[PDB]
Structure 1
Amino acid sequence: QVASGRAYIHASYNNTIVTITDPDGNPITWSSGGVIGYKGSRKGTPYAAQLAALDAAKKAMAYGMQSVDVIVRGTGAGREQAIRALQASGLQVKSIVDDTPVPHNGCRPKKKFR
């Protein structure tokens, strides 16, 4: 049980994954579009991200967490709705940072990205 921690939002075009971690980054719980029951294209929607962030926040709040720092990676659809869902959850959103990985022109991407 810890009150302060982090909330990671991994948001791609296919899915949204929320991971609530301790202050040092060690995961405490997590949820996603698949955990709240969706399969396929459905779990990439904003609503799917919303249920995922609430189900992750509720589990996190159930170990005594009250304030998180929010780290956002990726430019998927359900991104903003996941951030709303965290705020309007009972958890105190103490910060918001977009830590999306961007290569300084690194590995050749797949065909679909050219």
Structure 2
Amino acid sequence: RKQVSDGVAHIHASFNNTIVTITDRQGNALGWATAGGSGFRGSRKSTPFAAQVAAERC
């Protein structure tokens, strides 16, 4: 069995899109998602629910 027990999360929110990453302080991203990638476009790309399901999916 192999677990990390420690992590780092980074949220980058703009008026174009919201990006969510889960990564390691000595490694690379092990989860990545976007609010546009939740199935919301144009005026909806960066909305609270579009990002709420992106963080959940990640």
TM-score normalised to structure 2 length? 0.77
- Identity, in percent, stands at 59
Aligned residues: 56
Please state whether the residue corresponding to 2:4 is helix, strand or coil.
Answer: coil
**Contact 2:38 2:54 (8 Å CA) reproduced:** yes
User: 1:34, CA displacement in angstroms?
Assistant: 2.1
AA paired with 1:48? Answer: A
Moved over 3 A (4+): none
User: 1:37, CA displacement in angstroms?
Assistant: 1.5
Structure 1: where are the runs of 5+ without partners? 57-114
- Give 2:33's match in structure 1, choosing from 15, 31, 34: 31
Structure 2: where are the runs of 5+ without partners? none
Give CA deviations for 1:26-48 in whole Å, capped at 9, x if unaligned. 21111111221222221111111
User: 1:25, CA displacement in angstroms?
Assistant: 5.1
Work out which of the two has the higher radius of gyration on C-alpha atoms and give 1 or 2: 1
Give CA deviations for 1:58-105 in whole Å, capped at 9, x if unaligned. xxxxxxxxxxxxxxxxxxxxxxxxxxxxxxxxxxxxxxxxxxxxxxxx
